[PDB]
Amino acid sequence: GSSGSSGTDVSSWIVYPSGKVYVAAVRLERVVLTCELCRPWAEVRWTKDGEEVVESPALLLQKEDTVRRLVLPAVQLEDSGEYLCEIDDESASFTVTVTEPPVRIIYSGPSSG
């Protein structure tokens, strides 16, 4: 609800990408989704598992002139799923699989006793 009301001779709101897209991310990785539109004032909405994504300190929604993008300063293995970007009547498929990062924890020191 609480939505405006517009209309025009439009075929496919989602100008890009043109199909399914696969994206591989890592725990607490910085990803950047690319989703352009055939309209500047065209408002879009990202949905995760049927539900709509909500702004948060772990999910940043970027918006360009005529193209939109979803940046995540910190992702989680749980986030890994199916990102569907819906605008009006169409939706864009965005696969974002998150896995465990490479060895990082490195502890060293003089073994006492």
Side-chain angles (χ1 to χ4, degrees):
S2 70
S3 198
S5 193
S6 297
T8 187
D9 51 273
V10 63
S11 207
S12 55
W13 280 110
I14 304 153
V15 67
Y16 161 111
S18 189
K20 275 204 208 281
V21 175
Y22 280 49
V23 182
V26 207
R27 184 149 150 192
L28 312 172
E29 179 67 44
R30 183 270 207 75
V31 300
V32 179
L33 269 44
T34 310
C35 210
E36 189 150 278
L37 311 171
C38 61
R39 277 297 191 275
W41 29 262
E43 174 160 304
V44 306
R45 176 180 290 157
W46 300 77
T47 54
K48 209 163 152 294
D49 307 313
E51 277 279 66
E52 167 269 19
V53 309
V54 54
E55 273 149 89
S56 21
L59 175 148
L60 305 174
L61 299 183
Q62 293 320 315
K63 309 165 184 164
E64 213 150 319
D65 212 323
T66 41
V67 46
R68 305 272 185 286
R69 291 201 287 203
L70 158 56
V71 177
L72 290 77
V75 323
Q76 305 286 15
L77 307 172
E78 304 90 38
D79 287 308
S80 71
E82 209 197 50
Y83 280 73
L84 267 280
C85 178
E86 316 207 67
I87 150 150
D88 211 273
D89 294 33
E90 322 65 20
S91 53
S93 170
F94 282 105
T95 298
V96 179
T97 301
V98 181
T99 50
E100 302 156 283
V103 59
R104 211 277 293 194
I105 301 90
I106 297 162
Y107 280 56
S108 207
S111 208
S112 197

